[PDB]
Amino acid sequence: FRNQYDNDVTVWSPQGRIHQIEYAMEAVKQGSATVGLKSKTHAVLVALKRAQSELAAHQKKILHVDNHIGISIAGLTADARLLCNFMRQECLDSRFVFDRPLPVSRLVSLIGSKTQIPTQRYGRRPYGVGLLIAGYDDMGPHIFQTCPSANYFDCRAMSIGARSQSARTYLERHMSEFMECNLNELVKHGLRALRETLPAEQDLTTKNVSIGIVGKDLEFTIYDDDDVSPFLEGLEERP
Amino acid sequence: RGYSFSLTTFSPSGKLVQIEYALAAVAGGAPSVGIKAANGVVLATEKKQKSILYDERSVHKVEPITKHIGLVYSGMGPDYRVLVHRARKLAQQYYLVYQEPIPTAQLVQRVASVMQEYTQSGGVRPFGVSLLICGWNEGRPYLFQSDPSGAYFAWKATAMGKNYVNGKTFLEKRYNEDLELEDAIHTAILTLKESFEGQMTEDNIEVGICNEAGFRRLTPTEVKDYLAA
Amino acid sequence: MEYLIGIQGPDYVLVASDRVAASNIVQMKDDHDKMFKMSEKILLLCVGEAGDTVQFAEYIQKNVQLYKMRNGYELSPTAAANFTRRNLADCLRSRTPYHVNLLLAGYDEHEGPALYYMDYLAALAKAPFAAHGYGAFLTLSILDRYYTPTISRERAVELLRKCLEELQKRFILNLPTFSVRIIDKNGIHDLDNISFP
Amino acid sequence: RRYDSRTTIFSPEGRLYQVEYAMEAIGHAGTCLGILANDGVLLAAERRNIHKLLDEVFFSEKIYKLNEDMACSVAGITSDANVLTNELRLIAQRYLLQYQEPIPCEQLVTALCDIKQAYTQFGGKRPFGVSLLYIGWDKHYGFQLYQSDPSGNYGGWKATCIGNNSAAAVSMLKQDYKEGEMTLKSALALAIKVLNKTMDVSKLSAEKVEIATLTRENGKTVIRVLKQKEVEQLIKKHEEEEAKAEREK
Amino acid sequence: AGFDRHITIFSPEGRLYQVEYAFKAINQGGLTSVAVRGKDCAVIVTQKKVPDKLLDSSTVTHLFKITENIGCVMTGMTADSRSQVQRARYEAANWKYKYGYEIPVDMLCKRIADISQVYTQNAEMRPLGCCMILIGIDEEQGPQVYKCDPAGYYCGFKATAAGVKQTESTSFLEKKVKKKFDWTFEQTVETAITCLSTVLSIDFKPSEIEVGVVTVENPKFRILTEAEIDAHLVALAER
Amino acid sequence: TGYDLSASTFSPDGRVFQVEYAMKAVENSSTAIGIRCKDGVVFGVEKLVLSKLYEEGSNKRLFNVDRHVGMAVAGLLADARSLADIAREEASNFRSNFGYNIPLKHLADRVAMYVHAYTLYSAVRPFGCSFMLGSYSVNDGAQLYMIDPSGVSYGYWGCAIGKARQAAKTEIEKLQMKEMTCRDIVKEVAKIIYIVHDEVKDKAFELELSWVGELTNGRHEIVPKDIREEAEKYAKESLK
Amino acid sequence: MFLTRSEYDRGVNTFSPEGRLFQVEYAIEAIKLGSTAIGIQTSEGVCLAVEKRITSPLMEPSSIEKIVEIDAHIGCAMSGLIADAKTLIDKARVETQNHWFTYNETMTVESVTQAVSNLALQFGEEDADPGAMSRPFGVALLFGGVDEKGPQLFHMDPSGTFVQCDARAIGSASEGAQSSLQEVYHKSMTLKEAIKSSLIILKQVMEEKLNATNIELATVQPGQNFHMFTKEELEEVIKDI
Amino acid sequence: SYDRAITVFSPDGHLFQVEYAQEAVKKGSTAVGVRGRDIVVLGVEKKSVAKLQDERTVRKICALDDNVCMAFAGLTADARIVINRARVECQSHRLTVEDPVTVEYITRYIASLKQRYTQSNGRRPFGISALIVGFDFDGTPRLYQTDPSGTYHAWKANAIGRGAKSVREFLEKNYTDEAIETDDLTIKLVIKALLEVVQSGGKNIELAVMRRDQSLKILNPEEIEKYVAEIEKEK
Secondary structure (H helix, E strand, O other), X not given: OOOOOOOOOOOOOOOOOOXXXXXXXXXXXXXXXXXXXXXXXXXXXXXXXXXXXXXXXXXXXXXXXXXXXXXXXXXXXXXXXXXXXXXXXXXXXXXXXXOOOOOHHHHHHHHHHHHHHHHHEOOOOOOOEEEEEEEEOOOOXXXXXXXXXXXXXXXXXXXXXXXXXXXXXXXXXXXXXHOOXXXXXXXXXXXXXXXXXXXXXOOOOOOOEEEEEEXXXXXXXXXXXXXXXXXXXXXXXXX | OHHHHOOOOOOOOOOOHHHHHHHHHXXXXXXXXXXXXXXXXXXXXXXXXXXXXXXXXXXXXOEEOOOOEEEEEEEOHHHHHHHHHHHHHHHHHHHHHHOOOOOHHHHHHHHHHHHHHHHHOOOEOOXXXXXXXXXXXXXXXXXXXXXXXXXXXXXXXXXXXXXXXXHHHHHHHHOOOOOOHHHHHHHHHHHHHHHOOOOOOOOOEEEEEEOOOOOEEOOHHHHHHHHHO | OOOEEEEEOOOOEEEEEEOOEOOOOOOOEOOOOOEEEEEOOEEEEEEEXXXXXXXXXXXXXXXXXXXXXXXXXXXXXXXXXXXXXXXXXXXXHOOOOXXXXXXXXXXXXXXXXXXXXXXXXXXXXXXXXXXXXXXXXXXXXXXXXXXXXXXXXXXXXXXHXXXXXXXXXXXXOOOOEEEEEEEOOOOEEEEEEEEOO | OXXXXXXXXXXXXXXXXXXXXXXXXXXXXXXXXXXXXXXXXXXXXXXXXXXXXXXXXXXXXOEEEEEOXXXXXXXXXXXHXXXXXXXXXXXXXHHHHHHOOXXXXXXXXXXXXXXXXXXXXXXXXXXXXXXXXEEEEEOOOXXXXXXXXXOOOEEEEOEEEEOOOHHHHHHHHHHHOOOOOOOHHHHHHHHHHHHHHHOOOOOOOOOOEEEEEEXXXXXXXXXXXXXXXXXXXXXXXXXXXXXXXHHHO | OOOOOOOOOOOOOOOOHHHXXXXXXXXXXXXXXXXXXXXXXXXXXXXXXXXXXXXXXOOOOOEEEEXXXXXXXXXXXXXXXXXXXXXXXXHHHHHXXXXXXXXXXXXXXXXXXXXXXXXXXXXXXXOOOEEEEEEXXXXXXXXXXXXXXXXXXXXXXXXXXXXXXXXXXXXXXXXXXXXXOOOXXXXXXXXXXXHHXXXXXXXXOHHHEEEEEEEOOOOOOEEOOHHHHHXXXXXXXXX | OOOOOOOOOOOOOOOOHHHHHHHHHHHHOOOEEEEEOOOEEEEEEEEEOOOXXXXXXXXXXXXXXXXXXXXXXXXXXXXXXXXXXXXXXXXXXXXXXXXXXXXHHHHHHHHHHHHHHHHHOOOEOOOOEEEEEEEEEOOOEEEEEEEOOOOOEEEEOEEEEXXXXXXXXXXXXXXXXXXXXXXXHHHHHHHHHHHHOOOOOOOOEEEEEEEEEOOOOOOOEEOOHHHHHHHHHHHHHHHO | OOOOOOOOOOOOOXXXXXXXXXXXXXXXXXXXXXXXXXXXXXXXXXXXXXXXXXXXXXXXXXXXXXXXXXXXXXXXXXXXXXXXXXXXXXXXXXXXXXXXXXXXXXXXXXXXXXXXXXXXXXXXXXXXXXXXXXXXXXXXXXXXXXXXXEEEEEEEOOOOOEEEEOEEEXXXXXXXXXHHHHHHOOOOOOHHHXXXXXXHHHHHHOOOOOOOXXXXXXXXXXXXXXXXXXXXHHHHHHHHO | OOOOOOOOOOOOOOOHHHHHHHHHHXXXXXXXXXXXXXXXXXXXXXXXXXXXXXXXXXXOEEEOOOOEEEEEEEOHHHHHHHHHHHHHHHHHHHHHHOOOOOHHHHHHHHHHHHHHHHHOOOEOOOOEEEEEEEEOOOOOEEEEEEOOOOOEEEEOEEEEOOOHHHHHHHHHHHOOHHHHOOHHHXXXXXXXXXXXXXXXXXXXXXXXXXXXXXXXXXXXHHHHHXXXXXXXXXX
């Protein structure tokens, strides 16, 4: 049967696996894909937004935590809104207390600690949002992904979301080129990688793509529907 | 069915089963007998020990809550100590507030109220021990029993523990209201003798007496004399 | 600085109060009413530190009214007094003591007319006649001299008018108009304001 | 399937089963009877306990004096009763401290009944399994008898019996009680007659019953538990009166 | 059934099965501990099994010192055992602070035991599965040996055992006490070693046994050095 | 059988299965080894590279719990990072109140007690991480301590945690570590890490090595890349 | 071949194999139990319309209040459990007022939706506060107002997600009404056309024949404040249909 | 399956425990309210005397305050708690705003209390539905009804309790502006309607009227007898 061992985060399975945490991890797959890549001078997040209906506007997939840090959500939007608020307050706190932009890595550690507590204690469900966090700090451009499981990873590039393996595949092959890339080239590489996730009939449009760029001189900026047009125009056609 | 597991659930038929199950624990407990004579109350219980290795002086089934009140228990042993300590404490609180030794009836009401509290919440388990409380207040002997349910009854004589039903019958046949304690202590040892299932010895039985002087535990030598009869 | 006077009688209790509410020196209102009707036959007259007076009176009035709705029988005058005293006493120890001096007047069918006096410290005393305020010092003696436990209602309003005219002749503060009301088995009955023009 | 656990789940058909189950418990308890008479109100109970080795140290096992002007008899889980009686005694004393007058009888009942309703509404606690009859004199409504249920629903009854064979008693009371004509003496007799029928024992032991009467004498209520000699006389008078009717038959 | 599975529920025959299950855990460890009380000395001996050569032998011990003059041997789950030792050490100090004299051994067992009843009566926690035997010298009553079991029972014994071979060990000890000859320090230690050895059939070497002694002449609990253990072991073989 | 659902429960035979189930979690994780030699303690973790995309020198399984002590973890990483935080807090407190660097044996005990608490209550699951702590202080010496999900803490001359624990122990056993010096051990740890790694099942591994000892002046530190590189070469050559 | 076991649906705080958090999904289904409400946002203003669903002639029509004013600038049409809506409309009313007090300005429609959404998200037991409903809220609100960016209509769902919608229908006939809305909506339509179009769609979806009593219609044109068409005004527009 | 907890939502989004509490109201005694132009009349059936039971204690119709009166159908005990809590609020509003509570404010307060109970598991919904009748400051008569769910609606006339469906049908047909024209006519309409569902006659109906400024008056049994007679004669 094995229906048992899956009811709560507090029950270890006979083989060492906490099933609810794994089930939570599945939530990220349900969400629309997002791709994050880094260059020696800039970090970029690109997202494929989805719309309930033609009349409805596309959802926000990229959110600004701070001038130096921004996140893209894949998964339940609610968990993301809650985590983002925690992150924003933690960043605001550092500026008031130490007058320094919070090191991006430190923030991810804090998101991990908050995220882990639901996993070990009966009660709150594990957060089911998967987050890609991008920021430029003194150490440099940084791209980190956070699983619904609290584990976090530092990545040269990553795509989280539905059909994200295809994007990871493109990113791995063209990865070396990214480090020395110019900003236009880096966003262009990313837009192509998310294109792979899209169904063959669908095409990247100004409406479904959101680009967020943070860099030594650029505060995190989410280029949106009409401002993605410069980055999108240079792109070619589906392979 | 479902009613049996919960303590806050009345069974169809309005019986709180976990309490009934709790009383069953007391029944399995070692026999204890209490007789209220005119001059005193004798509490006695079997202290049968698994091995000669156990040191008898270490733990006592019959304990003194206050100078004039003493109790004996049948049921789960760890639980008795919790109740005894709360009882010793509840009495000292009476002394501080009213500067008079607590009337026995009052302590039994207070200890019982504690027992009822444990019954109400789902998290806790009902106490599994029943206590026989004996005291001399206002020149009058008193004997009371508090069951895990939280209910106190006043018995001229009663037996709790294994073979309680047979014990009570023997006592009803052998009980005279005018009995003096020296005769009564003999009656009690006979009541325990009915269900001992072993040669009674001074160590095997523990006996306590309450009178004007106050609760005292007969020491092993004294009981040996009473057993000699 | 505010005057409350009450005269109990064989079948009635007559209560009067000055109608002046004032700030430092300007007598902002000439028609303040210091009588609050707790019930059909109970009146609480309250004088005291500003704010505390209205706040304590309203709390007591509403609580007494809740009893009426909840139980269907109005509280007895004596019971209400004990209730107000408990509340004021409890507060006296607290960091928010209401500095209020009160006179409670009521008619109970079983126990007849009653007038109760409570000081800020919360002492309650049933009294044949009583007054609160600096004015009381001047007028309590006039009542003492002319009061008979058998005084008639007409005689009582007259005694009260005599008490008030002394305040006009000797009290430093100007209390020009007074409000007078009688509680009887019938209930609180307003009587014409005794006004010394 | 099972909509009868937890006390907080309405069953399809809107019935709170745990309260109903609690009411069943009162049925197992010893019969307690209260009759209201113009002169006084009486509570008579059957002391179910009859074990030979039990002592009557207390004023009464099942009649408790809540306050100077009121008394109660309890039927149901004894432990639950002890808690409620302690609470009733505190609720009354609190009214006296606040209003310096005796608690009106209905109010004491209404307040306990409210504690009883709460136990039903909140999830953790079991509904209290006791039903109790309150007798008292209040200035507002004179002599009053009130019966309470585990539900927290209370009522004013001229006469009622709670406990085993309650139905038989109410039927007997319904024919026998004469409204506006009862006197304590007649009522004590009605009580013995109803108690005799309800109790299984052929002869009321006179040690198997406890009868307590509340009367106002000299402006102060007196709650007195009739002593055994007084009850023995009542039983004899009933035995003779019934025998005389049989002898006539 | 379902009568087991929660400590609070009582069996239809009033047996509180979960507490009984805990006593089984002490045996699962596979180690036995024997304590014997002499006229002037109290000794606790336990089997020390080191599973791996890599483990440091010094770290593995079941003998702990609750206070300078009280020593305990805890048999059962290792983790639970350490937890109880800390509570005992805290309780022992708290007595000195509040009452000004070293806790009597009986009172330490009583406090530790009473803590166990709370676990037995409250729903969330599990009875700790360990049994602690305390050895101490009380000036008024001479040497003392007390055992507290997961139930909350706290009896004091002339001699006792805990573990897999407890029943056999008790029988051996019972025969030796019945033929009472009183026990000198050497005999008390010798009786303990012979008992553990006979029940286990081990024929022990100094490394496999840890022996702790309290004596009236030197009241402080001392864990005997391997050489000291060897001396007693050699004597037993010689005679 | 409902015995295994919670840690509060005890099985009829006396076993608390949920704790045992938690111990199986560590076996899912990759092997990590710590060896204590006379000079100091060297820890090594085989960190599988799941994807080329992940940055090197990240996803670290070796954490510094205080200036003088280092922690190597195996098992669910999230719990481990959280346990590391508990350890760091405990170390800070010992310094703040007692005014000196925490003795490692005490640190292990305090963290173990925290880990054990989770074992008793039913609200919280046992932690799924097994970790090793090591420190070198001139007074204390070199100490390696390993804490299981149960909360059992013991001091190990050499220790291994993770999927290949049994295999690694056999290799560690033939080392005569007590005599060996810290620099030599780093090569040896690598040899064992390489031997245990299964190339077929696990595509690739990056060895992360850390050490504390007289050489590090009692500060746990990541082995300098020159030393690590030399060791990785020694290991491949030995693998032959 | 039917596998209908479920067993992860009951109890929020449980993620189904496939990570679906079904209790929240079921709450979204509840809004379908509610009366249909349709909102069209046009440059001229945003119009909101709802079907009253009056059970008995004796019930007073005014009391049913499916369109309410959060503040002069923003109004809300709610479909779903009426009771949980009352709490959400209240958080919104307090938050608009709190913004005036703290910043002396009028909250944008989006911020007000974010504010009510934040309350809705709390159902997950996100906070430790005792006074938070455990169940996800069962109401969907369409919030329409004239702000700095001009007429805007945002739709909020029991999940707590909010999005701007040019036209949306929430309720029993939302599927199908939405389809019709897609065909009729053109960005250029004036409010007068939208009111007529929305009422045409409602007439089709509603079981009863449209009458002034059965419908509630409101508009928030930029100059005017939230306006509810009175029976006389409603009669004129319905007559045009 | 989805009916054991108030918090759980059924596939199809129905909260079953709240609906079940509404079933409880149906088991309760009938109550009818008619909003006359100058009088609001609230009438409730009385189950039976029981002969030995004093009737003063059992009162379905109660006055929350001077201008607001409430009648309930459902678990009796719950009603006593809600009625008491409403009374505290009426007095508390008077303390806070110095003004008498409007009928709707009391209805909203009573409703919120009930919703609060439905919102969290660990509390059972109050199984009472109430008809609150009151006259507002303008003097317009107002009748509102509340349900265990917490929904409040204003009804020109309504019946809650057992047989409510039958009486409400009778009221729908019978109610007209003409019927409410005379204060006696209004009392007659409620009596006639209750008669439809009451097994007995006037002996089993308790009825009360609140006039524009007068306090609630429970009509004496004799006054009821007169009204039933006029209705029976006209029949």
